[PDB]
């Protein structure tokens, strides 16, 4: 009967935005409000209208009028600084453009929504707006920036400039029902595709009392008392008030998968016209039962279910009776005498807001839908005696009263009808529970290590790193934000948290340019930490920076002389995502060679040095290589991105990878074929042909000189301008090694038996090749510094690189790290990242940029020997979301209970503070 | 690839209005002067601004600025009295609110959509406007009239309150771009129902220069020349001018099953915003690019088939080789060299219509498309040096040429960019023809009486009768029309029409309240009935009336005395839905009695008395039970409904038929059993038991009086107040004739054999009931009268009362005819129609109402004797249509060649004229 007839979605409502009479400025206050309540109907302020004022004829006029409605405490403030303004421009702005800016920052605040991720996102505006008061005081005498600032387009343009919304932004006008139309077409567009979140709401503002006088001259309009009676005996008017509200909304589907808060639910919506009505103002009860009829058939709602009405309620003798027939046609027809439909009007508390008055009706139900309670209409002295509301099957709720759940669950109706003939007609319902849903030694030895830890923890357990993100678009908002969050984390209500809600509420913030971030344990740190960072202090666990670098990070994958008994093994068993692509590796490297990684790192024992029978020189390279990936996916998971890449002699494999050249399976090949056959290559021969490496602190420039007198040395590895390794016969290097002591220049042996990048590896090409046959080199889509072909920056898109010949290469022939990393310095990159179980390359990274006159480079180092392998990754994520690296810092606190016990996460942190100046337009008249 | 991924309706364009510059005020206009490369930019006229000048400061500001542009020749005038509004309410009225109700009604004309048909329909209008201009005049000072005048809602919600309209009714405001998102709007809105129909387009009005003061104050925007030279070497700016238009949107299914005339196709739309620019001011191409083919998306389209565009083309010098750039992403992408996309813009034509662009350039398209021509676009001296049209494949096509049809079809898109960062694009295709596309002896009696008929034909070929229709809202109008008609008919253009092309036009336009019609064969005899028309003179061949009647018409069946030789013959040949009825009726009757009627009907031997073996009387009493069902449905077909119905003693079969108490066939079985018992009982019985029946004037209280002598004679029917038929033996009756005559009061006898409604019936009563079993009477849902419950009205809704109790009481009992016809006059009834061969109830319906005080009934007649059967019941149309009755008059000329040869159908009669006087809002400043 009343079923859908199209497969629509569910629009979910996630952030609501308040700035009616009453000093309502928040969701929380108007709740407060309705429920004790509170008329906001107020006398006209002293300092308002001055402007027409002190002319005999109008003031004289304007007193004997009523000037009596809501009226907003401070409307000439605006923080021209936060949303980038000049003070010329910025008192030439209408008060309905500060509304929609502000309100649309207190959505997505309320929302928990950060602004910074909408940037560029396909998000609609859709804002009603009805009478361009404040333009009257420019064309008083003028400036050209009165065109922009009083346009009724751009109230809606430049929420959408400041924001960077790529969607539909339009600035909708159907008089009183303006804010309802704009949500209709909001649900509409989500429904059609077109967008994905919608800002919806009105805004108006009482600047001069020109309308106010006109209604006031035809009489029988404005009340004498500027008190709304909505359904009452005594109806005779309303008053005009000024205000505006703001929505988030976005498909049900979405909301579920990206774990907003839902509020309430809008099922469906519909508008049209009365027609040819008695008069252009007067209402036609037939066209608003159609209305009624076809937004309940698009909801897919049978009326007789529904519990509360929120009626247009303007408070008129003869407007209120037709409002109450149509009702009993659609939604009181056919129910029983002891199943009414309960009626209000928010008007009663806040005033007639025209262009605002559906955002006000709707972010009062959308509070009584998210809460359990139907607060009162106040004014309601008895029936209207033209209104029979037993036999329209209606009642006037003037108590607190509960949903009565007729259908067994929540469902309203919101209604709202212009002064033209234009009719609108919201259906809601409260959220639903269906809403909210849609090896075997390694298995001994990880037994074993849980049980372990478990136990472990139980005799001291380990306090928790929580990273605590401030932000702001300026250093000195940042800090004043930390001085109050840490007065606020110092009171009992801060102490009373469990330090992750806190997190969690603040990852959900705006992440502006200017960032820091704070790695506490417990209250006390943070607090310490927070006024550490309110003034210019540095403290070991705060991260702060003043703005983004100019070029994304570079990824340096060393990974030799990077190894211990224990890595990879704390981080595998309290992480997931580090545990899977480890066990995926280790599948692959068990299909190639036949044995599994994980008996090596899960075991203690092992060092990797005469623990392990099977090739030490093979391990060491896989277990490195397993634990590269799993770091790289890891950050990945977290929303890092590298825009570079850069390997030595090892993590080529890796980085081909992380690149997109090859495949994972297709690089596991490489290095498992280069691994074993070094390993089998240098256990053939002993003695007689076996030649080792040596570092020595040596130039390119230098090398050429000095070799010229031993024939049979190479050249390795360019670790630094000044430092570079070499291999050959041990007299050769020992020859080296004595010529640089007595230059003072330092050397060392490495202490290695194996030996790559020479002579020994010729040999292993001819069988190496054939193992790497059928690998498919693929373009590379990143950025690459290939240390075999000289250091030479290879962009996105280019032809594959990482053929046969490639690995051929780089195995036997030198590599050209410091070339490399001298060239991406060239490029503008400053950060780089080291992906090993050890940071030992990073040293010569510091070096070259220093070289290459780079000194502030951010070196950032993951696990680090001797250090927890957790608390380390953390504040590399930290280091790349304080220099505006890509960073999805919502993942780094994952929701456990959603729709179940959200309370106690999600804290009640402070919100962000803005300083307002007066921006006024002077007039004289 | 560019495939819908939604299935969704192609959209129709099928109207459209101009209000341009240059006296542009039809499409035909339009047309020509966009072939000829017309430049409709002129000076400020000497009037304008009147109001602001005479002050010095101001008028030496203005004369220092450009102060050049579109300008309307009179924005002042307006008809008030036409659109119902007072002096003093006009005078406050913006005149983007009267563009709108003019251009709606001219859009309708050129659509030939009758404004009348879409009352009370979903029809929604979306207009665009920026800026209210007007209200600037009225606070100089003023009346409270100017809040609703000035308003921008009320620019649409007039719209829909004068035309009755009870759809969607917005205002959108995106600047320059406003009257491209409407048509978004209303495009998306009929693919997702919510509408019908939907006006669609923009307005804009210079009535101050302050905000053209503004933007030369900015510098560097307007052009010097006033001339836009959009793509060429020589751009410096625009002007900005007023003007308006509208689109009808319908979707082509709609359109293709209503007849309506398709000029061209929407595809898709598609719109969003430009973000973060250089900029609020500053253009994005990467969001034009997104915008352009997010509209080839929804359109299923690829942008590479594309032939034409037109482009916003606002003369700037930076701003056009942005929108170029965007377009050779998209549109200009894999191209041929030898293909390009030809480019133009029609503000070099008419310039810069901030609100109305839009409906400027879908208008130039849309003739365009209806055409098979492309206008220049005239000021291009020269391509742009900073935009490369060769690498970028576009084509500025400066001179008169065809579409080259790349894909085979015409395909063209219109951009629009509003200067607060809003965008929008819509694609346009030509109407294709693939849219155009979703009883042995009675036919020897037939194939006879046809081959008669078009031999009689050859010798003498008959001249169809016209119904020509004209009307308005006050009959000084409607005459003023008639006049003008009959002059464009006495020209050359109209003696060369059809005089059913005329008909046709004329049955499409709007049919006001005060309705008029003329019946005539020839041009001579419409020009005559015509100007007769144009003073009160009366004529036999004009309809006339001053205003619609307050209650429907009342429908009479009854069917006694009104049987001819030849009765439903000449309709039947010469009528599809008269022959159709008339067979099924056929079929039925051969089910139950086992002969058919159509042997009857179609031989002219038999006269129904002596020349019919099976008892005349059962064989008339079907045969005009079968006229008169066809004739009612005949009426449906047109559109005639009756609100009340009435019978006398024949006619209550079909009656109850029509009323909806029975079913076809049930009633059909109702009059074969009677007609047949009451053939057989009077064959039954000869000399012993028959009575016959006579006419006696004498009322209902005589009648009384005088049957206590006469105790056997009964009342059979009260033909009027002061007439009766009675019945009884011979004998009973002599006497009571002779009695009448002594007292001078005529009678009659009949000559009738049968006697129904006397003793005769009660044995037929047992049989009767058996042979009505099965029949299941159901509720009436139309206003009834029953003649056998004396007379009293019965409600629709009301319980079955068609038993067979019920046929049983009005065979033997009299029926209160007179009574039924008395009721319905004080029920508020005036109109009767009477279904039959032949009118002979309208005499006694007659005297009734007179009796009753009413003396100027409408008494309608239909196929009567000796006269045309075509060209009566055309006039009962004609007479239910003059006095404001349901008719479709649109039926009367059905299209026989509907996308064919539309040319010769669809005549070039004169369009509805309006009397514009001044309304202007007085200031001084």
Known sequence: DWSRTRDVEDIAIVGVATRFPGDLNTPDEMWEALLEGKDCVTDLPEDRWTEFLDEPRIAERVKKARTR???????????????????????????????????????????????????????????????????????????????????????????????????????????????????????????????????????????????????????????????????????????????????????????????????????????????????????????????????????????????????????????????????????????????????????????????????????????????????????????????????????????????????????????????????????????????????????????????????????????????????????????????????????????????????????????????????????????????????????PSVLSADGPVTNGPVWVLAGFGAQHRKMGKSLYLRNEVFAEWINKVDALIQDERGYSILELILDDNVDYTDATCEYPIEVVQLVIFAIQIALGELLRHHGAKPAAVVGQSLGEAAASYFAGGLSLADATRTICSRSHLMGEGEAMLFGEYIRLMALVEYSADEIKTVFSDYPDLEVCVYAAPTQTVIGGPPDQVDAIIARAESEGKFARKFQTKGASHTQQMDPLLGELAAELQGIEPKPLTTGYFSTVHEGTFIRPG??????????????????????????????????????????????????????????????IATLARKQDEVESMISAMAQLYVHGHDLDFRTLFPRRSKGLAGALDFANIPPTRFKRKEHWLPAHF
């Open 69 to 539: 409605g809501g009226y907003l405490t401070d409307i000439k403030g605006f923080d021209s600084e936060f949303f980038a303004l000049s003070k010329m421009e910025a008192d030439n702005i209408d008060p309905q453009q500060r509304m929609a800016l502000e309100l649309t920052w207190e959505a997505l605040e309320h929302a928990r929504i950060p602004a910074s991720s909408l940037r560029g996102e396909s998000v609609g505006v859709y804002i009603g707006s009805s009478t361009n008061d404040y333009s009257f005081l420019a064309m008083s005498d003028a400036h050209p920036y009165a065109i922009t600032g009083t346009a009724s387009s751009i109230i809606a343009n430049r929420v959408s400039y400041f924001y960077d919304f790529r969607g539909p932004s339009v600035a909708v006008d159907t008089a009183c029902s303006s804010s309802l139309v704009a949500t209709h077409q909001g649900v509409q567009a989500l429904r059609a595709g077109e967008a994905d979140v919608a800002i919806v709401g009105g805004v108006n503002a009482l600047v001069t009392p020109l309308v106010t006088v006109g209604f006031d001259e035809v009489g029988g309009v404005l009340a004498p008392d500027g008190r709304i009676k909505s359904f009452s005996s005594d109806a005779d008017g309303y008053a005009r008030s000024e205000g505006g509200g703001m929505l988030v909304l976005k498909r049900i589907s979405d909301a579920r998968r990206d774990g907003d808060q839902i509020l309430a639910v809008i099922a469906g919506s519909a508008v049209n016209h009365d027609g040819r009505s008695n008069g252009l103002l007067a209402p036609n009860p037939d066209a608003q039962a159609e209305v009624l009829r076809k937004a309940y058939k698009d909801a897919g709602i049978n009326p007789r279910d529904v519990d509360y009405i929120e009626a247009h309620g303007t408070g008129t003798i003869l407007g209120d009776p037709i409002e109450a027939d149509a009702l009993g046609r659609i939604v009181g027809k056919g129910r029983p005498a002891d199943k009414p439909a309960l009626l209000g009007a928010v008007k009663s508390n806040l005033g007639h807001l025209e262009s605002a008055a559906g955002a006000a009706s709707l972010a009062k139900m959308t509070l009584a839908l998210a809460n359990d309670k139907l607060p009162p209409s106040i004014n309601y002295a008895g029936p209207n005696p033209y209104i029979d509301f037993e036999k329209e099957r209606l009642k006037v709720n003037d108590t607190v009263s509960d949903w009565p759940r007729y259908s067994g669950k929540a469902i309203a109706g919101v209604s709202g009808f212009g002064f033209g003939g234009a009719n609108a007609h919201v259906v809601m319902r409260e959220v639903l529970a269906g809403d909210l849903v849609e090896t075997e030694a390694a298995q001994r030895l990880l037994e074993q290590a849980r049980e372990e830890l478990e136990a472990k923890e139980a005799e001291e357990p380990t306090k928790q790193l929580v990273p605590l993100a401030v932000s702001a678009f300026l250093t000195s908002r940042k800090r004043q934000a930390a001085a109050e969050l840490a007065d606020w984390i110092d009171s009992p209500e801060g102490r009373a948290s469990s330090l992750e809600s806190i997190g969690r509420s603040l990852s959900r913030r705006n992440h502006g340019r200017s960032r820091a971030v704070v790695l506490a344990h417990d209250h006390d740190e943070a607090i310490k930490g927070l006024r550490a960072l309110a003034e210019g202090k540095q403290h």
């Open 798 to 859: 280019s032809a594959p690189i990482h053929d046969v010949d490639y690995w051929k290469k780089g195995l036997r022939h030198s590599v050209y790290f410091t070339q490399g990393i001298r060239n991406a310095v060239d490029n503008g990159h400053t950060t780089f990242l080291e992906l090993a179980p050890n940071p030992v390359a990073l040293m010569q990274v510091g070096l070259t940029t220093a070289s290459a006159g780079l000194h502030d480079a951010q070196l």
